[PDB]
Amino acid sequence: HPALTPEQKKELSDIAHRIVAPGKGILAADESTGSIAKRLQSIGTENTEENRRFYRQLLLTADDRVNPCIGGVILFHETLYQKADDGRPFPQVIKSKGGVVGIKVDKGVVPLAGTNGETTTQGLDGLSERCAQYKKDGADFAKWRCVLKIGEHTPSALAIMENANVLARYASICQQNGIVPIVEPEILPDGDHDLKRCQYVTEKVLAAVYKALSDHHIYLEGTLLKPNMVTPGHACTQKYSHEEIAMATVTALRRTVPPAVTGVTFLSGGQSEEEASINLNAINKCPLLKPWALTFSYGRALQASALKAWGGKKENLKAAQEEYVKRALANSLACQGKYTPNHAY
Amino acid sequence: HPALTPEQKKELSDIAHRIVAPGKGILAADESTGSIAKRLQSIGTENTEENRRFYRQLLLTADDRVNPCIGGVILFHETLYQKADDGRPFPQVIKSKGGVVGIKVDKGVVPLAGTNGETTTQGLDGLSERCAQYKKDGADFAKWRCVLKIGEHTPSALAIMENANVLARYASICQQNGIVPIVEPEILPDGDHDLKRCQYVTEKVLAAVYKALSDHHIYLEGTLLKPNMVTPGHACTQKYSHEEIAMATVTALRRTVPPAVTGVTFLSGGQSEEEASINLNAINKCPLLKPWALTFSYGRALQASALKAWGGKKENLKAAQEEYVKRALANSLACQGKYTPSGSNHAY
Amino acid sequence: HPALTPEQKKELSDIAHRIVAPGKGILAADESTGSIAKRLQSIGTENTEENRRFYRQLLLTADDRVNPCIGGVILFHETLYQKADDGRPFPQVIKSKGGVVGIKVDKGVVPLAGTNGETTTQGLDGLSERCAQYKKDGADFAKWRCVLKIGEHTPSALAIMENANVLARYASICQQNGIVPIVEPEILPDGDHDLKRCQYVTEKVLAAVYKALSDHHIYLEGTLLKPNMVTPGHACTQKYSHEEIAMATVTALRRTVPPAVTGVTFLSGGQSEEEASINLNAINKCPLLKPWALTFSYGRALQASALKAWGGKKENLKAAQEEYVKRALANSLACQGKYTPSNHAY
Amino acid sequence: HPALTPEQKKELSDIAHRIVAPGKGILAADESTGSIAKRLQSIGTENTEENRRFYRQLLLTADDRVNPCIGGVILFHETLYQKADDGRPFPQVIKSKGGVVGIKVDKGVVPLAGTNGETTTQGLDGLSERCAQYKKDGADFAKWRCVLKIGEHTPSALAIMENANVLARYASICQQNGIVPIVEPEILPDGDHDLKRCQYVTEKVLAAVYKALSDHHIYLEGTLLKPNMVTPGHACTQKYSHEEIAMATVTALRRTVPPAVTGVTFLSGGQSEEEASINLNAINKCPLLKPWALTFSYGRALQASALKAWGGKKENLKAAQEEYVKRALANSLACQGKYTPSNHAY
């Protein structure tokens, strides 16, 4: 009673490797209806199904310069079943440009009673049947987001254990259905903590994640990790260089992520488009041994400038697509250490 | 940042105590559509909504002799929103007879990959909103069933840990919504294992359950436990007395269940009606100290003869209700150690 | 492959029940040489082997009024091999008065690196052989003390897990050698935390303790628990009644201690002689259901006045023994709820 | 509350890297008195301190061809304080040849009650003081051996958790004293299980080991791992190539051992001299990515021919040393993948 056959393992490993192939990263376009509404609101655009469709089309149909930059695209359920103006389903559009289609499958955070505002994430019910259908409809990987926060009593032992366990359940169900799970334990940058505190918490969270994945018999070669970079908190007064951020990030990963993991696809969080590229580039130039692909799974850091240039106006299509292409090319170079605009750990 | 206020704790504790008050147990009538279908096929009756309504009505409207016997009734979702012939919602029927209304909220078992046929249970998604709605609609306690199996390499560490964890998540969400959770970690009797193997596994499962409930800040006084009795496997060749089953059961509970737990409501599993009554009565006569109510949460051990006597025929209503009443009375006496058919310590 | 046979289980259960039989508790006299030195220093007495022997003799040979009060006596290694003036080994003196002999077997606390001053406890190496010898030499139960502290980031997950685990190892070894283990996870009263914080930490620690005992296959009927009472911190500004202390303590125990545990023998900690008796009495009068004996395992709360009355002078023997008898009698009444000098909010 | 300062970290990391520098491995000569007795008995030699000293001297004073092969030497306590014929302490002999001195610090296995013959390991009591003394006396790394067995119900959850936890306690204490800990969770080859069963158990054990090291705040860059290679059981009838053994071994390590671990020093266990060299060579030629040194920490695989050529006779000194030197050279090439005498299926 092994969880997976050699054939199933090969399929998962091959998918995971395609997504993070050299020079490639992930466009994270899986904002739910409530979250994308706030993005559209920031440009005074109504949150209609058509406006959401057109915006996703804008990103997915950028010119072929993005093909070598984008190994995967994460979609929200609605977008997976939408079509471009030429009638092609968006999964077909993505594949025709050399991309793997991903689907976000979690159903949001819920409060953990007895904690200081901590959450876990729901979405396991009927997940297997959903994954089998998503697989039939063109998806080959999935995403599940857990959220943790650095504070006085947080993240607590309960929150670390519970989020690690539910990530492992999600990963197990995905792999039974031919879907590569992206494991996203995000530690929010909120607060005034410093770099080494983020590093400490990240190390503890990731140790818990991989012990849980082991307990649940997860095939690591058929997974990806989507962590926060190790950074000071948003309100931290002490300032750090990108090389220090890179060193703390790579050290934390080296202390917790088994080499069998196929790749690490960083979330951009609250970083600017340039900051996310500079940090990712510094991570890839960090002189330590890094036995996994180190690339991007960016939302805002790929979309910010495209969203503004668009402004909800059809005539700004080309201008908006150019901004996205410029960030896709930048981060493709960053994940190779080719982008130009220690014992203390 | 405590999970619950003193007012919320009092509500949950008062509910839990009402359900298992002396002489009272639970009617477990929460079979899902697929499971009740098998019950109806066994008496050649069609599985229609009306036949399900009629059958549930048959149990819930039995004469007032059941009132001091039934502290609680577990319903399936459909039944919570059905009505008796007089137009009364079934929850109002139950309450008017002194019972607390329960709702089963799990969404069935699912396979754990990498195990020898082991499962966990799903049903957490949107559970808080469901509990708030069920509370509004008259439910005060809930049920969630996890299933474990004694076998070669089972129950495994993973299966024990995961089922305990999901039970604790369910219990936490229930208590946030004023619903008393019934925690049901059922160890099936399938297999040829002997009595002391069942006792060992039951002790290990219950220790994991209560550590998980602690980790998730569960208020034990506002919970009930629905375990298997400790019995040999169905295929075991060695035979045991009811006194030995009782001693093994009470010993396992005394080694694992904190006295703050308000009550233990046993499942009947594959036991016959009489066997389940005799065993419960022996459990209550066991001379060891037992700091929780020890009563019943019975499905087939309350229903089997009523279902048969009914046979799907409206003219058999009174005869079917009489069979149910008889088992309700029997088990009311058994959960007091007062049941009669007339109506070594360190070896464990 | 059960850990114990029915015969080994009966032996352990019988011992545990003798120690905590109704009206009985434990004299904890197992201060090591460095700790008893501070006690003798407090009365201007030199810390010699003979002064330690004499002081322990004073306690162990008090008159027969203590016999129904004292179910057990915990000794330090040295004392287990000392003799009274009549030539009798101290274990024989204890047994002759109806007491079970206990031996402290831990080797003190050690720091946990990476923690905010937290410790675990050492003493497992060669413990099985030590237990076998102690059993031959008249001991039937043992004691092992872990120490946890309430503070900003303490007790940490690491400290709770590690102390629970080492207690389980100790208990397992003891039970293989016919010794009933007393499991002592002391949460110190140091600090300004309030009563509900102590209750919260005590509930979490004891849940960890009993999960570890389960994982290690410990026979609970052949164990005793020696916990702190649930009290405010020593420096807490909010004040509480003995009844609140009792309610918080009994509630924490009811939420964590399986009924199979044979007895709970409270440590006195920093409490005065009278405070420790009043609190134990209030615990036994608490109206909730308590399915285990609730009695005492007291050091200073049985010894403080005896030590002062002695003052190191052999001519104060009887006066000092009288002070210990008075506290033994007080606490025997208290563990029955017979001593006189909403639960949903917990 | 960080466990170590940057300076303490630098020292441990520097030591760890010196031991497993390219081409180098470890001579494991830390057999205790009882275990070396079995070795000497197999060559008809009396187990006296002098014969133990002479045999250890024979190994430690082998000619300078072993200097680039031997990065560290593990000694038993007795040997750390013995001297060569010329009066030089053995630690000075080792260092004068470019070797780091190691000390075995565990006190052997003890049974876990309630298990099917499983053990944990003892040795924590007073370990901090022992480590500080050993550091003073020339040791810079240590070894602690836990033993697990593949059987019907083994290794159990209890055995895995407890051995991982005690290994982490040992590692923590070592690092507080400037000693690099070698963590040895040996899964025995006993039994008739196949290669994938060993791989499965090895992955589960190592995942538990590294979670425990994380919980105890262990600095992984200042540690080494001494695991079993992944092999079929001794009584398994199915046959495997060295390339399959290598693939299963590297796959297991890639799934569990964080890249920050400085090196993996395989135990030889029951393997012959040639088999252990050939397997280590195939491990280093395995085409998968390996972010740690993969070298040897060998006892009998370095000593077997030398012990037999010696036969307890002083006049066989040079013939015996020659056999040891030949195996040090062989394994130095093997840990470089230069010794000569589908992946989804794992």
Ligand SMILES: O=P(O)(O)Oc1ccc2cc(OP(=O)(O)O)ccc2c1
């Ligand atoms: O809860 P929902 O809004 O439905 O899901 C989310 C939540 C956060 C996200 C963040 C993203 O950017 P990045 O931080 O991954 O780079 C991209 C997509 C995201 C989708």
Ligand SMILES: O=P(O)(O)Oc1ccc2cc(OP(=O)(O)O)ccc2c1
């Ligand atoms: O999965 P479902 O069938 O929908 O839910 C179930 C499963 C098992 C049951 C067993 C019962 O009898 P007892 O074993 O509690 O006495 C009573 C109700 C039950 C309901």
Ligand SMILES: O=P(O)(O)Oc1ccc2cc(OP(=O)(O)O)ccc2c1
């Ligand atoms: O560390 P050592 O000194 O060797 O052992 C101790 C430590 C604390 C003690 C406290 C006591 O009083 P109580 O708290 O048990 O009532 C009695 C004996 C004690 C012995």
Ligand SMILES: O=P(O)(O)Oc1ccc2cc(OP(=O)(O)O)ccc2c1
């Ligand atoms: O129990 P003790 O005898 O005191 O210690 C041991 C036990 C096993 C050993 C195995 C060795 O060979 P290898 O398996 O490390 O290659 C070398 C030294 C060993 C020492």
